[PDB]
Enzyme design. Structure first.
Site, short mmCIF file in Angstrom:
data_model
loop_
_atom_site.label_atom_id
_atom_site.label_comp_id
_atom_site.label_asym_id
_atom_site.label_seq_id
_atom_site.Cartn_x
_atom_site.Cartn_y
_atom_site.Cartn_z
N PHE A 1 33.06 48.87 33.60
CA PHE A 1 34.71 48.43 34.07
C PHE A 1 35.12 47.02 34.30
O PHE A 1 36.75 46.95 33.25
CB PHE A 1 35.25 48.69 35.19
CG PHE A 1 33.81 48.24 36.55
CD1 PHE A 1 34.51 46.75 37.14
CD2 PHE A 1 32.95 48.51 37.16
CE1 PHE A 1 34.01 46.56 37.65
CE2 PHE A 1 32.52 48.38 38.66
CZ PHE A 1 32.79 47.09 38.72
N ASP A 2 34.66 46.37 34.43
CA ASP A 2 34.75 44.82 33.96
C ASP A 2 34.10 43.78 33.14
O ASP A 2 32.84 43.81 34.08
CB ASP A 2 35.58 44.21 35.31
CG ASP A 2 36.49 43.36 34.93
OD1 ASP A 2 36.81 42.74 34.27
OD2 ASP A 2 36.57 42.53 36.08
N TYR B 1 33.57 48.11 47.76
CA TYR B 1 35.44 49.63 47.83
C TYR B 1 35.40 50.40 49.28
O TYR B 1 36.17 50.93 48.75
CB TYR B 1 35.89 49.20 46.54
CG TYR B 1 36.11 48.25 45.42
CD1 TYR B 1 36.87 47.58 46.32
CD2 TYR B 1 35.27 47.95 44.49
CE1 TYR B 1 37.28 46.08 45.61
CE2 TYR B 1 35.45 46.55 44.05
CZ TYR B 1 36.19 46.02 44.28
OH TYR B 1 37.02 44.78 43.44
N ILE C 1 34.36 40.83 47.19
CA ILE C 1 33.62 41.90 47.99
C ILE C 1 31.97 41.52 48.17
O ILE C 1 31.82 40.45 48.31
CB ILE C 1 33.21 42.21 47.49
CG1 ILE C 1 32.37 42.84 46.24
CG2 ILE C 1 34.78 43.67 46.76
CD1 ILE C 1 32.46 43.62 45.31
N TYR D 1 30.31 36.99 34.88
CA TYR D 1 29.68 38.42 34.89
C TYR D 1 30.24 40.02 34.64
O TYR D 1 31.46 40.02 33.64
CB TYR D 1 29.99 39.06 36.75
CG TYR D 1 31.63 39.85 36.70
CD1 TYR D 1 32.51 38.36 36.77
CD2 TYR D 1 31.68 40.56 36.70
CE1 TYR D 1 33.88 38.29 36.67
CE2 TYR D 1 33.30 41.06 36.48
CZ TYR D 1 34.49 39.52 36.60
OH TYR D 1 35.76 40.12 36.73
N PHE E 1 26.50 44.66 39.49
CA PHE E 1 26.88 43.55 38.68
C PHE E 1 26.20 42.62 37.97
O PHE E 1 24.55 42.19 38.80
CB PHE E 1 27.99 43.09 39.80
CG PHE E 1 28.96 43.37 40.02
CD1 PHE E 1 29.87 43.01 38.87
CD2 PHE E 1 28.98 44.04 41.10
CE1 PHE E 1 31.96 43.37 38.81
CE2 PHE E 1 30.67 44.73 41.39
CZ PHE E 1 31.54 44.23 40.74
#
Ligand SMILES: CO[C@H]1C[C@@H]2CC[C@@H](C)[C@@](O)(O2)C(=O)C(=O)N2CCCC[C@H]2C(=O)O[C@H]([C@H](C)C[C@@H]2CC[C@@H](O)[C@H](OC)C2)CC(=O)[C@H](C)/C=C(\C)[C@@H](O)[C@@H](OC)C(=O)[C@H](C)C[C@H](C)/C=C/C=C/C=C/1C
Lengths: 95, 107
Positions: free
Chosen positions: B36-37, B82, B56, B26, B99
């Protein structure tokens, strides 16, 4: 003091620590439930089982600690994640 | 809710049964495309068991819709992610997340 394998000790330590940080945003608590576990490591493998576990996962868990130390000095929070990358790796291997 | 939109299809019969390990790649980004990641930057697939509230909610319901091979974009509203609290220093309050996740294999 009590009899427990470093395996079991680190498994549930890492799980409890992660829940406190990730789940409750408690970075104070996760340091509490992690510092003890790190304390033992720094003192010594006594048995043969604690020896081999230390050979296997000792390095990662040490580096993970430096990342947490780095967080303490900078407040960056991406050091904490680089720390938790390594905790996840040792945890995943000890199941 | 969580929105799944195919980037590349899979076999459409091999779905992750509750309690399997999803190996996935991902990249996560905030609504505006701010990365971000990503596991692809580390060159290392992410694994998690589906159902154990390990990830999540948008992931729990999103990835459960995917079949092996499929690549998808998940648009996850803050409720299924979140929330108001975010995750401080990385995901702000209320953030809609996107995502891009590919389901490599089940184990
Ligand atoms: C350094 O990298 C972090 C993840 C980063 C941190 C910040 C977020 C932006 C992010 O960048 O991930 C990210 O992109 C993201 O949002 N993710 C990660 C990829 C999947 C989707 C989402 C997520 O659900 O994260 C998760 C999010 C942060 C928190 C969870 C949300 C759902 C809720 O039900 C859970 O309640 C507690 C907490 C993190 C995870 O995917 C990891 C795997 C899982 C957990 C921490 C918990 O499930 C914990 O439960 C106690 C466990 O059972 C684990 C296995 C026990 C072991 C010891 C802990 C391992 C630590 C793994 C940590 C990892 C890889």
């Amino acid at each position: 003091r009590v009899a427990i394998l470093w395996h079991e000790m680190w498994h549930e330590g890492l799980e409890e620590a992660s829940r406190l940080y990730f789940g409750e945003r408690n970075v104070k608590g996760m340091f509490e439930v992690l510092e003890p576990l790190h304390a033992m490591m720094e003192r010594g493998p006594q048995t043969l089982k604690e020896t081999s576990f230390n050979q296997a996962y000792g390095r990662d868990l040490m580096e993970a600690q430096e990342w947490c130390r780095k967080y303490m000095k900078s407040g960056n929070v991406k050091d904490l994640t680089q720390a938790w990358d390594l905790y996840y790796h040792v945890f995943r291997r000890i199941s | 809710g969580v929105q799944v939109e195919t980037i590349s299809p899979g076999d459409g019969r091999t779905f992750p049964k509750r309690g399997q390990t999803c190996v996935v790649h991902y990249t996560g980004m905030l609504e505006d495309g701010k990365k971000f990641d990503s596991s692809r930057d580390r060159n290392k697939p992410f694994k998690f068991m589906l159902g154990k509230q390990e990830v999540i909610r948008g992931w729990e319901e999103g990835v459960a819709q995917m079949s092996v091979g499929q690549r998808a974009k998940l648009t996850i509203s803050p409720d299924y992610a979140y929330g108001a609290t975010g995750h401080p220093g990385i995901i702000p309050p209320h953030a809609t997340l996107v995502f891009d996740v590919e389901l490599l294999k089940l184990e």
